[PDB]
RNA sequence: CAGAAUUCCGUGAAUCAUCGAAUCUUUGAACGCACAUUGCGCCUUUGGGUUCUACCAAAGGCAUGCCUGUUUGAGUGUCAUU
RNA sequence: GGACAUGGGUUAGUCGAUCCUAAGAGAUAGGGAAGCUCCGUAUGAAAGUUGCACGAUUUUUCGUGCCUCCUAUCGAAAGGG
RNA sequence: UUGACCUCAAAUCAGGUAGGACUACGCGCUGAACUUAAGCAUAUCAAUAAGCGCAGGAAAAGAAAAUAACCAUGAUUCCCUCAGUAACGGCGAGUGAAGCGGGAAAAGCUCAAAUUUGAAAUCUGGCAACAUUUCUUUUGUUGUCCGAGUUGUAAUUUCAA
């Protein structure tokens, strides 16, 4: 699953960036993703983490937007596309999220 | 509500008998030890032969769980003779031996021949 | 038997053992006449049964 | 509703009302068996918040447990060892008296599963508890998704393994630095196991 | 007197056959088997006696029903006719 | 003692039966080493111990 | 050797009669064995014993099927006719009992089911 | 070692393989009570021998704690109507 | 030959056991004990097999009845019988 | 006098259920001494052996009354590291964790506290019918009646709200 980018705590590691557990409620809100829908399309939700700065919020909102733009949601009923789905599901394959959204 | 005794006793109550919704065992077992299990074989040692021709008594190897009642019925049902007395012993090999004396109106020698161990 | 003894001595212990007012206000019930009028009204507004 | 009032009033154990009721009930409890069935929870609000529900398959039992420490059960105070182990008198059982209450009721009702328990009373000799039990064979329990979990065999005698609320407390199960000794044996094994890798 | 002559008075059994395990270990006056603990509803056993445990544990006997269970699991506990 | 229990008597019968020679055709089987046995008990030598 | 498919075609009473004949015959073979007998009769003891077993099996098969018939569509059935899996399997929650869900849980699965999705590189 | 050639171009040998139906003695947690006793009882039905009550036989039953429910009750526990 | 091999041999209403209780053992009530278990034996228990015909044709032991200080069992092949 | 309710009994009452075994691994209780300290008592051996209770295919733990003190992290478990470190210790002999970081695997939730009050909307059992089957052996559905339940069974909510 796609993971957020977070800064590690303490002065020894706060210069680095690493994968976190899940996206905050504010981050999902600002990217236009309901928290109940997030899990259904592989977006983890971390209710504990918060955004103390705009930089953390914007960085992870950008990760979600890139994920959504590369995401192909199949319709619940095959051959009857609905809102939020895709109509070109033919070229769907298992791809690495790190190939599309690496931690930089 | 007059109590003439200084002792309270439990009152009597109905106590229904069992009315099961299902029989626990589907098929009743056939009689264990009917008559072909009770009489195992005639005994034809030399001492048994003397019992046949001197005391009008037959000697049988019988089931360990047979008693003098069931040995009498088994001999009557299998060989149609009427024992007058039955004596029983458990041999040192652990098997049961019965001395079946027949009435004065039957001949043990003829019964032995009819069974075929002579 | 022990259960009969218990429920009788329980009534006695409640008679001794001075009772705090919030508990003592019970055992002061409606009189017979007022109680009949109350139940006459209540019996008019009974909840509907399963058949009803 | 009434439950909030019962919760707040239950906090006032020194009030005249609760002192009187405690005295009469403790006397009543001492008159019956050490373990006896309760027709209903004496504390309906406390029972609900501990998982009890007023449906078939939920059972309340009451039990009194002797108060005080654990005298070392050695013949004449004789311990046959070093002075650090010569103590007999001022010793303490590692499990709570509430845990013992659950253990004994669970043995008494071996067809049931112990769910939880709560304090109801005490005098100098006894503490009184009510133990909530569930019948895993009853259909009302087995078809109920909120209590269904307890039917599964992993929950057999959870009180004997310290898996009730009071059992996990007595085991020191908790999060963070104050509970580093954690599940003791498992933590001890992790620290006392020599790990010898294939160095290649 | 403590040796040879005193062995002449040994003619009273302290133990007889245990109904549960069949060993000549049933203490008559205690009515208890020194080996298996009969009539207690638990089989006597001690972790200091691993060799004693090995003499009597599962698999030293017939295992009649346990072998049937093993065969049934192999096919998923099926019933009915083929 | 001739005063004996049924259970004791049953055990004596079994003990006497196991106290017999093996028939030779048992040892003549292909792949059998039943030629001699260390289970020949005798009354004066090795005691039954109930 | 009696043929079991032929045996199943017979009534229980006739089978009971046939069984008594076999037992009487087996008793005769054993008497003759004691008082000297050839090897054919000795092999006939074993065959007769297996024939008695075949008849007993048919009688019991018939009786059990009748019991299964009598208890068809009944809530409570004789114990020997129920499953003989393991004791633990008999006590386990049924698949139906395991699949029970609250209304709240049913609604959640209806409105937010896990989707099928893919990431295009 | 035989025996079985009433079988061998066959629903048929085999201590064969496999296995979804059965049988499964006395026991054992072990369950009518016991047990250094194959000791001593009780219940239901069906049979035997003159026996609706004795005796014999067979079949099926009779342990404990606890749970849900049933029935029959107990209480100078609390009440309504006569 | 008490060794070895092959066979044979122990018959009960009246002799014992079985029944009874003894010192004692010991379930149950109930109380201890973390527990293995310990104490206890009408014990702080609603611990009932027995005594009556009131219904019942009609020549007899199934229904309520009102009743009353009952009792686990094991324990003797020399005690009792 | 009866009936209701409450509490308490009895039954070979209708249907269930527990015990015993296996203990490598798992969760607890109880609990030594040999030993080391060149003696020895605190200490160590050891929260170990023995003793007792209780499980599963794994168990336990688990969605923070958790870290931190950062630009902060984010249930649990396990590995590497932290680290033979901080610390404990006749500060003697000896003992000795944790946060961060990397990795394996990842998943999240349920109640109690609320007036459904224009309607106990909930549940068990019996009986009957109808389905169903690893299966005449399994598992349900509907109807009806009786019980449970207002001293509260359902429904929306569980603080992330
Ligand atoms: Mg005799
Ligand atoms: Mg848990
Ligand atoms: Mg000496
Ligand atoms: Mg002497
Ligand atoms: Mg000899
Ligand atoms: Mg005499
Ligand atoms: Mg006696
Ligand atoms: Mg030293
Ligand atoms: Mg030294
Ligand atoms: Mg020294
Ligand atoms: Mg150990
Ligand atoms: Mg298992
Ligand atoms: Mg678990
Ligand atoms: Mg939370
Ligand atoms: Mg240490
Ligand atoms: Zn034994």
Would you list the DSSP string of F11-47? Answer: HHHHHHHTSSPPPHHHHTSTT---SS-S----TTTS-
How many Å apart are CA A4 and CA A62, to the nearest integer? 10
Between chain C and chain D, how many beta carbons pairs sit less than 8 Å apart? Answer: 26
Mark yes or no for CB contact D152/G91 under 8 Å: no
**What is the CA A51 to chain-centroid distance, rounded?**
15
E9 Cβ contact partners less than 8 Å away, ≥ 6 residues apart = none
How many Å apart are CA A20 and CA B29, to the nearest integer? 71
3-class DSSP state for residue G118? strand
- What token pair was written down for D112? 């049931």
C-alpha distances (whole Å) from G43 to each of A75, B115, D195, E70, G4 are 76, 21, 68, 35, 20
DSSP state of B35: S
Given a contact as 3+ CB pairs under 8 Å, which chains touch E? Answer: F, G
Q: Is there a contact between D100 and D162 (Cβ–Cβ < 8 Å)?
A: no
How many Å apart are CA E28 and CA E26, to the nearest integer? 6
Q: Is there a contact between G41 and G19 (Cβ–Cβ < 8 Å)?
A: no
Closest chain E CA to residue F7: E17
Rounded to 5°, angle at Cα D29 from D28 and D30: 95
> Within 13 Å, how many C-alpha atoms sit on residue G92's CB side?
10
Taking contacts as CB-CB distances below 8 angstroms, the residues of chain B near F12 are 92
Q: Is there a contact between D91 and D73 (Cβ–Cβ < 8 Å)?
A: no
How many Å apart are CA B75 and CA D129, to the nearest integer? 71
3-class DSSP state for residue C52? coil
C-alpha distances (whole Å) from D170 to each of B10, C2, D66, D183 are 45, 37, 18, 11
Radius of gyration of chain B (CA): 25
Please name the nucleotide lying closest to B66, CA to C1'. H57
Q: Which residues of E are annotated as a binding site for Zn(2+)?
A: 18, 21, 33, 36
Q: Is there a contact between E53 and E35 (Cβ–Cβ < 8 Å)?
A: no
What's the farthest any 2 CA atoms get from each other in chain F? 47
Residue D45 neighbours by CB distance under 10 Å: 19
User: Which string of b and e fits D136-145 if b means at least 16 CB within 10 Å?
Assistant: bebeebbebe
Residue B52 neighbours by CB distance under 10 Å: 22
How many Å apart are CA G117 and CA A86, to the nearest integer? 10
Rounded to 5°, angle at Cα A18 from A14 and A22: 115
Q: Is there a contact between A49 and A22 (Cβ–Cβ < 8 Å)?
A: yes
Determine C/E contact with 3+ CB pairs under 8 A as the test. Answer: no
Compute the distance from residue A46 Cα to the ligand 14 centre, in Å. 12
Compute the distance from residue F11 Cα to the ligand 5 centre, in Å. 19
How many Å apart are CA G71 and CA B23, to the nearest integer? 10
3-class DSSP state for residue D132? strand
How many Å apart are CA F23 and CA F34, to the nearest integer? 10
Residue D145 at interface with chain G, using a CB cutoff of 8 Å: yes
Residue E76 neighbours by CB distance under 10 Å: 7
Q: Residue B116: left (phi > 0), alpha (psi -120 to 50), or beta?
A: left
User: For residue A93, what are the β-bridge partners?
Assistant: none
How many Å apart are CA D171 and CA D183, to the nearest integer? 7
Question: Which residue in G83, G85, G87 has the most chain E C-beta atoms within 10 A of its own C-beta, making it the best mutation to test that interface?
Answer: G85
Q: Is there a contact between D166 and D96 (Cβ–Cβ < 8 Å)?
A: yes
Nearest residue to D119 (alpha-carbon basis) of D166, D157, D82, D87? D166
Q: Is there a contact between A47 and A25 (Cβ–Cβ < 8 Å)?
A: yes
Long-range pairs of G16-25 with CB within 8 A, sequence gap ≥ 24: G16/G59, G18/G55, G19/G52, G19/G55, G19/G56, G19/G59, G22/G48, G22/G51, G22/G52, G22/G55, G23/B36, G23/G52, G24/B36
Compute the distance from residue D192 Cα to the ligand 4 centre, in Å. 58
How many Å apart are CA G71 and CA D175, to the nearest integer? 56
> Within 13 Å, how many C-alpha atoms sit on residue C40's CB side?
6
D5 Cβ contact partners less than 8 Å away, ≥ 6 residues apart = none
For chain E, positions 3-42, list CB contacts with chain F under 8 A.
13, 16-17, 24
Nearest residue to G112 (alpha-carbon basis) of C8, C36, A38? A38
Method: cryo-EM
User: Which string of b and e fits B10-44 if b means at least 16 CB within 10 Å?
Assistant: eeeeeeeeeeeeebeebbeeeeeeebbbbbbbbbb
How many Å apart are CA C20 and CA B36, to the nearest integer? 85
C-alpha distance from G106 to closest chain D C-alpha (Å): 12
User: For residue B86, what are the β-bridge partners?
Assistant: B100
Which residue is associated with the tokens 């032929």? G6
C-alpha distance from G108 to closest chain A C-alpha (Å): 9
Query: Torsion angle, CA of D135/D139/D140/D142, rounded to 10 degrees?
Result: 70
How many Å apart are CA B44 and CA B49, to the nearest integer? 6
Given a contact as 3+ CB pairs under 8 Å, which chains touch C? Answer: D
Q: Which of A36, A42, A91 sits opposite G117 (nearest CB)?
A: A42
User: In Å, what is the separation between the CA of D24 and the C1' of J155?
Assistant: 40
How many Å apart are CA D130 and CA G93, to the nearest integer? 28
Rounded to 5°, angle at Cα C37 from C34 and C38: 85
Residue G47 neighbours by CB distance under 10 Å: 13
Given strand D126-134, what is the order of strands in its sheet?
Answer: D35-38, D58-66, D126-134, D113-122
3-class DSSP state for residue B41? strand
DSSP state of A23: B
Residue A3 Cβ < 7 Å to strand J: yes
- What token pair was written down for G109? 């699965």
Helix, strand, coil share (%) of chain G residues, nearest 5: 70, 0, 30
How many Å apart are CA E36 and CA E45, to the nearest integer? 7
Is residue G41 classed exposed, middle or buried when 0-12, 13-18 and 19+ CB atoms within 10 A define those classes? middle
Residue D94 Cβ < 7 Å to strand J: yes
How many Å apart are CA G82 and CA B104, to the nearest integer? 57
Closest chain E CA to residue G83: E79
DSSP string over D154-188: GGTTTTTTT-SHHHHHHTT--SSGGGTT-SHHHHH
User: For residue D126, what are the β-bridge partners?
Assistant: D66
Residue D143 at interface with chain G, using a CB cutoff of 8 Å: yes
Residue B72 neighbours by CB distance under 10 Å: 19
Question: H-helix or E-strand containing G98?
Answer: helix G95-99
Question: Chain I: nucleotides under 7 Å from a protein CB?
Answer: 2-12, 16, 25-26, 30-37, 44-48, 64-65, 67-70, 77
Question: Chain H: nucleotides under 7 Å from a protein CB?
Answer: 1-4, 11-13, 19-24, 27-30, 35-38, 56-61, 65-78, 80-81
Q: Is there a contact between D24 and C14 (Cβ–Cβ < 8 Å)?
A: yes
Residue G40 Cβ < 7 Å to strand J: no
SS (H, E, C) B71-116: HHHHHHHHHCCCEEEEEEEECCCCCEEEEEEECCCCCHHHHHHHHC
Between chain E and chain F, how many beta carbons pairs sit less than 8 Å apart? Answer: 7
Is residue D113 classed exposed, middle or buried when 0-12, 13-18 and 19+ CB atoms within 10 A define those classes? buried
D176 Cβ contact partners less than 8 Å away, ≥ 6 residues apart = none
3-class DSSP state for residue E79? coil
Compute the distance from residue D95 Cα to the ligand 11 centre, in Å. 19
- Resolution value, angstrom units: 1.9
3-class DSSP state for residue D76? coil
Nearest residue to E35 (alpha-carbon basis) of E17, E48, E62? E17
Taking contacts as CB-CB distances below 8 angstroms, the residues of chain G near B39 are 27
Q: Which of B24, B36, B41 sits opposite G34 (nearest CB)?
A: B41
Peptide bond into E39 cis (omega under 30): yes
Residue B26 Cβ < 7 Å to strand J: no
> Within 13 Å, how many C-alpha atoms sit on residue E41's CB side?
0
Taking contacts as CB-CB distances below 8 angstroms, the residues of chain G near E69 are 86
C-alpha distances (whole Å) from D152 to each of D26, G47, G90, G93 are 37, 51, 12, 7
C-alpha distances (whole Å) from E66 to each of E61, G79, G81, G91 are 11, 20, 21, 19
């Amino acid at each position: 699953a796609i993971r957020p980018a977070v800064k590690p705590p303490t002065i020894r590691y706060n210069m680095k960036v690493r994968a976190g557990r899940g996206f905050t409620l504010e981050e999902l809100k600002a990217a236009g993703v309901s928290r109940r829908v997030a899990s259904t399309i592989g977006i983890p939700v971390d209710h504990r983490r918060r955004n103390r700065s705009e930089e953390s919020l914007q960085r992870n909102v950008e990760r979600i937007k890139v994920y959504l733009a590369h995401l192909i949601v199949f319709p619940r009923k095959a051959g009857q596309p609905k809102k939020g789905d895709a109509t070109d599901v033919s070229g769907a394959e298992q791809t690495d999220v790190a190939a599309v959204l690496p931690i930089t | 509500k007059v109590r003439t005794s200084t002792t309270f006793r439990r009152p009597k109550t109905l106590q229904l008998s069992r009315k099961p919704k299902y029989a626990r065992k589907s098929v009743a077992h056939a009689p264990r030890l009917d008559e072909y299990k009770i009489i195992v074989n005639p005994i034809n040692s030399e001492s048994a032969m003397k019992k046949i021709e001197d005391d009008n008594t037959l000697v049988f190897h019988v089931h360990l769980k047979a008693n003098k009642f069931t040995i009498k019925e088994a001999v009557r049902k299998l060989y149609s003779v009427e024992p007058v007395k039955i004596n029983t012993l458990i041999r040192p090999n652990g098997t049961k031996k019965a001395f079946v004396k027949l009435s004065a109106d039957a001949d043990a020698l003829d019964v032995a021949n009819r069974i075929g161990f002579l | 038997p022990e259960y009969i003894r218990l429920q009788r001595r329980r009534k006695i212990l409640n008679l001794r053992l001075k009772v705090p007012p919030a508990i003592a206000q019970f055992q002061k019930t409606l009189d017979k006449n007022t109680a009949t009028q109350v139940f006459k009204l209540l019996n008019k507004y009974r909840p509907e049964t399963a058949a009803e | 509703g009434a439950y909030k009032y019962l919760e707040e009033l239950a906090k006032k154990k020194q009030s005249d009302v609760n002192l009187f009721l405690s005295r009469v009930r403790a006397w009543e409890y001492r008159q019956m068996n050490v373990i006896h069935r309760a027709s209903r929870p004496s504390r309906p609000d406390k029972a609900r918040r501990l998982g009890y529900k007023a449906k078939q398959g939920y059972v309340i039992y009451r039990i009194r447990v002797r108060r005080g420490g654990r005298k070392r059960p050695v013949p004449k105070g004789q311990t046959y060892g070093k002075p650090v182990h010569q103590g007999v008198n001022h010793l303490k059982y590692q499990r709570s008296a509430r845990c013992t209450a659950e253990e004994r009721v669970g043995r008494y009702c071996s067809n049931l599963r112990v769910l939880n328990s709560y304090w109801v009373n005490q005098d100098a000799t006894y503490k009184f508890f009510e133990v909530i039990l569930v019948d895993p064979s009853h259909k009302a329990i087995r078809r109920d998704p909120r209590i269904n979990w307890i039917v599964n065999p992993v929950h057999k005698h959870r009180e004997s393994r310290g898996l009730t609320s009071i059992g996990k407390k007595s085991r020191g199960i908790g999060k963070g630095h104050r509970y580093n000794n954690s599940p003791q044996h498992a933590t001890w094994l992790r620290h006392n196991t020599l790990s010898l890798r294939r160095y290649r | 007197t403590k040796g040879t002559q005193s062995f002449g008075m040994r003619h009273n059994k302290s133990h007889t056959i245990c109904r549960r395990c069949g060993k000549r270990s049933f203490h008559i006056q205690k009515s208890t088997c020194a080996c298996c603990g009969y009539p207690a509803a638990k089989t006597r056993s001690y972790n200091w006696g691993a060799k004693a445990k090995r003499r009597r544990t599962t698999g030293t006997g017939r295992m009649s029903y346990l072998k049937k269970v093993h065969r049934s699991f192999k096919n998923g506990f099926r019933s009915g006719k083929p | 003692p001739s005063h004996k229990s049924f259970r004791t008597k049953q055990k004596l019968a079994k003990a006497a039966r196991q106290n017999r020679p093996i028939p030779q055709w048992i040892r003549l089987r292909t792949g059998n080493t039943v030629h001699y046995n260390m289970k020949r008990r005798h009354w004066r030598r090795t005691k039954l111990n109930i | 050797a009696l043929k079991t498919f032929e045996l199943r075609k017979q009534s229980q009473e006739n089978l009971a009669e046939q069984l008594q004949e076999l037992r009487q015959e087996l008793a005769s073979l054993r008497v003759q064995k004691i008082a000297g007998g050839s090897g054919s009769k000795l092999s006939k003891i074993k065959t007769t014993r297996k024939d008695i077993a075949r008849i007993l099996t048919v009688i019991n098969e018939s009786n059990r099927l009748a019991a299964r018939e009598a208890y068809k569509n009944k809530k409570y059935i004789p114990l020997d006719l129920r499953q003989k899996k393991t004791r633990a399997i008999r006590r386990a929650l049924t698949p139906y009992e395991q699949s029970r869900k609250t209304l709240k849980q049913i609604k959640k699965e209806r409105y937010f089911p896990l989707r099928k999705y893919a990431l295009k590189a």
